[PDB]
Design an enzyme around this catalytic site. Structure first.
Site: not given
Ligand SMILES: O=P(O)(O)OCCNS(=O)(=O)c1ccc(OC(F)(F)F)cc1
Ligand SMILES: Cc1ncc(COP(=O)(O)O)c(/C=N/[C@@H](CO)C(=O)O)c1O
Ligand SMILES: Cc1ncc(COP(=O)(O)O)c(/C=N/[C@@H](CO)C(=O)O)c1O
Ligand SMILES: O=P(O)(O)OCCNS(=O)(=O)c1ccc(OC(F)(F)F)cc1
Ligand SMILES: [Cl-]
Ligand SMILES: [Cl-]
Ligand SMILES: [Cl-]
Ligand SMILES: [Cl-]
Ligand SMILES: [Cl-]
Ligand SMILES: [Cl-]
Ligand SMILES: [Cl-]
Ligand SMILES: [Cl-]
Ligand SMILES: [Cl-]
Ligand SMILES: [Cl-]
Ligand SMILES: [Cl-]
Ligand SMILES: [Cl-]
Ligand SMILES: [Cl-]
Ligand SMILES: [Cl-]
Ligand SMILES: [Cl-]
Ligand SMILES: [Cl-]
Ligand SMILES: [Cl-]
Ligand SMILES: [Cl-]
Ligand SMILES: [Cl-]
Ligand SMILES: [Cl-]
Ligand SMILES: [Cl-]
Ligand SMILES: [Cl-]
Ligand SMILES: [Cs+]
Ligand SMILES: [Cs+]
Ligand SMILES: [Cs+]
Ligand SMILES: [Cs+]
Lengths: 264, 395, 395, 264
Positions: A49, A60, A175
């Site tokens: 990802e 984020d 997800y």
């Molecule tokens: O381990 P963590 O807590 O850092 O989570 C991973 C983050 N990376 S990601 O690309 O999957 C990811 C997935 C969804 C996000 O926002 C949303 F849910 F609103 F879509 C933001 C980042």
């Protein structure tokens, strides 16, 4: 799209879940990011990802906020990200590559043209963090026309209308959001997993707060297809900015441990 | 699914992470219910009159139009408690939070006027208030920051990215992403995801409703045009709303031209930006060719916001409202002119609207026209900024 | 010979050099004529409503009286254009100057609120305005000085003697001594020689008239007491006047106690000074044993005036009004309390009145009482003063 | 009172007008003030007008404002002024002594007691600068009870009611005001003089702006009894603060010139 279906079929044959790390493309620089990504794959990562640096990543937490700014400090642009993505695909033919996007970068030069560029460089899926299913129609249509899996978020506060929506509209993987809030390893679901399987959803990956091997084994035990870990990986990058070689060795040992936990 | 249309034509929408959609749906339903509730309306009317001081005066400015055929009225939102129109809609949103059983308020602010408004409303109604503000803005708005804290609010500087309004906007949504069960996000302008553009308009529309009643009483007719500055769009849409179906009434929004449109250092995305998706909405934006959100610029901190509310983009597209820009120097000359000839010190934001009315008058001084300027705030907060410019300039 | 009684009992009079008596007689006759002139009254009413924003709100403060049997209303002169009650009577005096054919305004100011009020009235009505201000006060009130000059007024620092209010008072009378044929002296409080105590009261009495109508509408009865700070006496006598014949209504004036009456560093001549003759009137004064006029003291610049209007001295002597004092520290605690629990930032002057109402409540919390505080101005001008104290104090 | 009537009778026998200087008592110090006052008399002064330093002299221009502050800088008090006045009278039995007062210093310890103290030290008249004829009743009554002439101002903007008032109520001399404004030599009437004589007023002295011998001769020519000069004298004090001896010599030469101009 095709690469996720082949991966999950192989993982089940190997009685394994997927471990999927997230990194920001170009953090802390283009050359080092490419070496980071090759290390993750070589250490056991099942898919990737990858975030394109964006000015305003409102989904984020601070760890990935700083990753975006490190990438901006290197001058990373979306066009340089798509050149990286092509090189990553040329090196790794089977590894599924998912993008974490913000809506304006997809919409900027035309939604259809964005997904056409994704297809040309070999991206497999796109998650648009600030597009809810309610706004998703033009994104998911463009995605499917270009053989890109649109990735939808199943939140913990979801209802059955949402579950049927994500199950019908999504491809590649679902997800499975761990919790409310934003991304982060500072803040650490079987019911949803069964209904998603009932509705023939894409296989589920739990994310948002996975930082330890015990959490990967927990996701596999809950019947999820695997787990995604972003901030824990980015933190290792952030800890080791002064020693690039140590950074890769620490990344290799963490990914190896997390992937080991996905057998059981 | 929503109760109300989230879009104005192609502009608007709800472009937030999935986790926040139940919060927006809850807020929409509470708003729809409150608008049918005479008890809610009476409480809002009570706060507006007896606490904020509504109705506000409509002042005829005789001296500045002498020797022309322009009649100019100023709608005196500068006299509202707090010193600007921001107070109107925070009182309504604070009542909406209570309707939902919420006990905490999240707010964002760039200039500090909306943050001060949020803090005073929360102090009055017994809500715990926390306010995000770009660290750059905390440093330049020490007076308003001290006002907020005197009223019991927590002010949190945001060191994210640019450390300005948009990053404060980001951290507010980040916070609300996890706290929406107990906290309400009190957005400060007619922008962001549905239902906020709709709510903010309806909780500001007393500006235009009062103006219409007052001009009919004083002049026997509707204005030829009503003129308002446009940051996110809240005072403008509050002035415009009750006139939208009066198709003889011109609706003129004034964006900040900064150092000049040609310089790129401006805050005029509606006429000189490009549509994008950010802050929960599809709207004209200041953005790079690559789709990064750019930084806007204006002498007035309250107009320094790189987008605009979606109803303004829509009213423009169909030709119902016209949007123009006014530079720093034009706004400063309007500020001085009102001080010296009417004894009113206007906000530098409102001075953009006044400057354009003065242009309409001066360009065509024998044109008979009846104009109202939305005087969105008072300019006590701006006298240090004007002093430093005036004497760095020589005068 | 005069048309009206220059005295309130033994207090008041016209103690000016002979050369100025024709000016005071002219002003008295113009005032008497204007009070019988419906045209003058209509113009004054027009300016008060449509320019200054009257009527002002009467705000019920629920949070600060919780758990007691006090009901407390604030009369919101803080919402008047300019930010204080001073604006009311300068509009009337500016119209009186025009009635007399005068084209220039002389004014004195200590805190700057009356000078800003005089400058805005003169800008609006086309009068050339010059304002005397002790050099000490010019240095500490740079914001208000810049406001006055933005409005086209000439601000003249007075290096005479103490270089404070009384010396500014002196140079104003010195100037008027030679210019009264073309200039009107716009005195800022209900003090000085007849007819000023009478004029200022009548041009401030809308405070109390509105309060009476508003409390009758909201509560069905008159207040038990109305409470106002007393510098020279203008906002207090404006609040008191319409209640003087309502003998059940207590009239409470609050003088500044400064560091404490026992320290001598206060501004409370009515209860702790001695009658003297100065500034054109016989009134209680701060004075040395030898009859030199002393310097007063208060944390609030607007109360730092070593005498008091003669009508207050008279109302006290006959027992109709009671006067008390409130120290710096008490006023500061009232300032913080209103900010945090009602979301209103009061002038440090008005905070003296609020502090005494809070004392009446807290000392006898099961006493049923309906109180109105004259909230004479807003406290934006005071936040730097409060900030410096709060953090020099540790909190 | 008696001393003015004797002076004016002698001056008319010598075909002369009166020249009357004003100084602030104790400016620039008690010792130097006493020498200043003796020099004025020895140089030709016919009577004296003497100010008691007051915190707020609202009828004085900047020259005498600074004189008051110089006196305050020396610590001069009203009680020290009245000790000076007694010593001045003991040295000069016939010279009329008038006080320039502000109302609060007269009212402070009782109006009657003020005028009793004036009588005890031998003062002849009292002008209270901020008491108009309209407020004068208790002051003029106390003055007359203690043989003190109350001095009234006849302004240039006077009407016939005022003229009859000042003529009836005043004693000693009538202060014929030159102009509006405050005291000063920076800013430089026969009709009033005749009506005052018609109404049997006290003899008139013109003041406020007399700084040159030509103005003294003008006052005598207009049929006034003399002229008063305050700021011109005080300016000489202010010019010569660093050289006390030069100050007295300059004072002597100015007073001599002004008194010479009163013969014709
Ligand atoms: O381990 P963590 O807590 O850092 O989570 C991973 C983050 N990376 S990601 O690309 O999957 C990811 C997935 C969804 C996000 O926002 C949303 F849910 F609103 F879509 C933001 C980042
Ligand atoms: C006195 C005044 N007039 C106009 C505007 C412009 O805002 P709309 O277009 O009316 O919504 C503002 C805004 N202020 C924001 C921005 O920082 C804030 O305080 O945080 C303002 O304070
Ligand atoms: C907000 C406020 N409340 C009360 C008072 C007190 O004045 P009264 O008693 O009401 O006449 C003042 C006064 N200000 C004067 C003094 O310097 C001035 O501005 O010059 C004031 O500004
Ligand atoms: O020569 P100038 O211009 O300095 O005039 C002399 C001033 N000294 S004085 O005692 O006679 C004097 C006389 C009257 C004054 O005020 C009043 F007129 F209101 F009463 C003040 C001073
Ligand atoms: Cl692998
Ligand atoms: Cl593809
Ligand atoms: Cl593909
Ligand atoms: Cl599916
Ligand atoms: Cl709908
Ligand atoms: Cl649409
Ligand atoms: Cl409604
Ligand atoms: Cl501050
Ligand atoms: Cl109305
Ligand atoms: Cl009409
Ligand atoms: Cl032109
Ligand atoms: Cl009378
Ligand atoms: Cl009397
Ligand atoms: Cl009337
Ligand atoms: Cl300033
Ligand atoms: Cl009313
Ligand atoms: Cl009732
Ligand atoms: Cl108690
Ligand atoms: Cl002699
Ligand atoms: Cl005697
Ligand atoms: Cl005698
Ligand atoms: Cl006589
Ligand atoms: Cs006009
Ligand atoms: Cs804008
Ligand atoms: Cs109560
Ligand atoms: Cs006082």
């Amino acid at each position: 799209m095709e690469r996720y279906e082949n991966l999950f079929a192989q993982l089940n044959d190997r009685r394994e879940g997927a471990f999927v790390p997230f990194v920001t493309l170009g953090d802390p620089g283009i050359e080092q990011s490419l070496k980071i990504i090759d290390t993750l794959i070589d250490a056991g990562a099942d898919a990737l990802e990858l975030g394109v640096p964006f000015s305003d990543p409102l989904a984020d937490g601070p760890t990935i906020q700083n990753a975006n700014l490190r990438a901006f400090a290197a001058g990373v642009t979306p066009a340089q990200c798509f050149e990286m993505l092509a090189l990553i695909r040329e090196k790794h033919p089977t590894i599924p590559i998912g993008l974490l996007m913000y809506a304006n970068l997809v919409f900027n030069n035309g939604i259809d043209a964005f997904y056409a560029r994704c297809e040309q460089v070999g991206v497999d899926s796109v998650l648009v963090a600030d597009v809810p299913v309610e706004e998703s129609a033009p994104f998911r249509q463009a995605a499917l026309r270009h053989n890109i899996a649109p990735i939808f978020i199943c939140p913990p506060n979801a209802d059955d209308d949402l579950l049927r929506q994500v199950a019908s509209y999504g491809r590649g993987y679902t997800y499975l959001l761990s919790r409310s809030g934003v991304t982060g390893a500072e803040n650490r679901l079987h019911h949803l997993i069964e209904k998603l399987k009932e509705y023939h959803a894409a296989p589920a990956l739990q994310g948002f707060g996975i930082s330890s091997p015990e959490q990967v084994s927990a996701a596999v035990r809950a019947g999820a297809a695997g787990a995604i870990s972003g901030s824990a990986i980015v933190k290792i990058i952030e800890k080791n900015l002064a020693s690039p070689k140590q950074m890769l060795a620490e990344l290799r040992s963490f990914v190896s441990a997390m992937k080991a936990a996905s057998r059981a | 699914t929503t109760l109300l249309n989230p879009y104005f034509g192609e502009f608007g929408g709800m472009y937030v992470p999935q986790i926040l959609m139940p919060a927006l749906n809850q807020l929409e339903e509470a708003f729809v219910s409150a608008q049918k509730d005479p008890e809610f309306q009476a409480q809002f009317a009570d706060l507006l009159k007896n606490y904020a001081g509504r109705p506000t005066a409509l002042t005829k400015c005789q001296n500045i139009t002498a020797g022309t055929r322009t009649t100019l009225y100023l709608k005196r939102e500068d006299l509202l408690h707090g010193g600007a129109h921001k107070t109107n809609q925070v009182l309504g949103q604070a009542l909406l939070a209570k309707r939902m059983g919420k006990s905490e308020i999240i707010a964002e602010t760039g200039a500090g006027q909306h943050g001060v408004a949020s803090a005073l409303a929360s102090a009055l109604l017994g809500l715990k208030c926390r306010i995000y503000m770009g660290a750059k803005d905390v440093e330049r708005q020490s007076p308003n920051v001290f006002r907020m804290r005197l009223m019991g609010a927590e002010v949190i500087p945001v060191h994210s990215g640019s450390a300005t309004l948009t990053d404060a906007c980001n951290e507010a949504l980040r916070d609300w992403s996890g706290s929406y069960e107990t906290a309400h996000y009190m957005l400060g302008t007619a922008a962001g995801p549905h239902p906020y553009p709709t709510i903010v308009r309806e909780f500001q529309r007393m500006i235009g409703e009062e103006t219409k009643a007052q001009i009919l009483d004083k002049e026997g007719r509707l204005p030829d045009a009503v003129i308002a500055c446009v940051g996110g769009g809240s005072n403008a849409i509050g002035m415009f709303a009750d006139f939208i179906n009066d198709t003889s009434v011109g609706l003129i929004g004034v964006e900040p031209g900064g150092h000049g449109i040609e310089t790129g250092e401006h805050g005029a995305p509606l006429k000189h930006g490009r549509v994008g998706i950010y802050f929960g909405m599809k709207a004209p934006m200041m953005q790079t060719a690559d789709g990064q959100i750019e930084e806007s610029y204006s002498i007035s901190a309250g107009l320094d916001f790189p987008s605009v509310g979606p109803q303004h983009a829509y009213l423009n597209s169909i030709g119902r409202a016209d949007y123009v820009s006014i530079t720093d120097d034009e706004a400063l000359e309007a500020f001085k002119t009102l001080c010296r000839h009417e004894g009113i010190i206007p906000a530098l934001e409102s001075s953009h609207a006044l400057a354009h009315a003065l242009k309409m008058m001066r360009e065509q001084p024998e044109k008979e026209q009846l104009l109202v300027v939305n005087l969105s705030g008072r300019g006590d907060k701006d006298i240090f900024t004007v002093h430093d410019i005036l004497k760095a300039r020589g005068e």
